[PDB]
Design a protein around this ligand. Structure first.
Ligand SMILES: Cc1cn([C@H]2C[C@H](OP(=O)(O)O)[C@@H](COP(=O)(O)O)O2)c(=O)[nH]c1=O
Ligand SMILES: [Ca+2]
Length: 135
């Protein structure tokens, strides 16, 4: 895996954002995780959804540097969203959210799962501490 620079364009929710990547604006969806819905009517505003959005927004807007790290499989999902691990000043947003109990490890599709065990150990810790989603 290799990290590449990106420039924040707009934070959308806990797990989706818009970034300028390789010269063009693209919406990215965080790999291996799922923050609660705050948009789609079929799910409604789920608990911790607004919390997850806020955590992400703060984290990416206050960063000096943002980097995207694609995994080894497909780089986009069916909606044309970039699939990656996003780092804010060297800290992985995907893991950060899981650690706070603001996201669950989900959508584990091989071979896009390099950081699965890392994120899982952080989720176990959040559960163990009964944080947010786990309370
Ligand atoms: C994170 C991720 C999401 N997705 C898909 C699965 C879901 O499709 P469906 O929309 O058919 O359920 C949707 C979940 O994203 P959201 O959490 O943004 O909804 O995006 C992938 O294709 N691969 C992934 O790695
Ligand atoms: Ca989501």
């Amino acid at each position: 895996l290799h990290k590449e620079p990106a420039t924040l364009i707009k934070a959308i929710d806990g797990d989706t954002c818009k970034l300028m990547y390789k010269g063009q604006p693209m919406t990215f969806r965080l790999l291996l995780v799922d923050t609660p819905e705050t948009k789609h009517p079929k799910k409604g505003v789920e608990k911790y959804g607004p919390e997850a959005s806020a955590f992400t927004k703060k984290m990416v807007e206050n960063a000096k540097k943002i980097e995207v790290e694609f995994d080894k499989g497909q780089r986009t999902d069916k909606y044309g969203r970039g699939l990656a691990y996003i780092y804010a000043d060297g800290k992985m947003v995907n893991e950060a959210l899981v650690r706070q109990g603001l996201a669950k490890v989900a959508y584990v599709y091989k071979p896009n799962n390099t950081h699965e065990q890392h994120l899982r150990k952080s989720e176990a810790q959040a559960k163990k501490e009964k944080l947010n989603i786990w309370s």
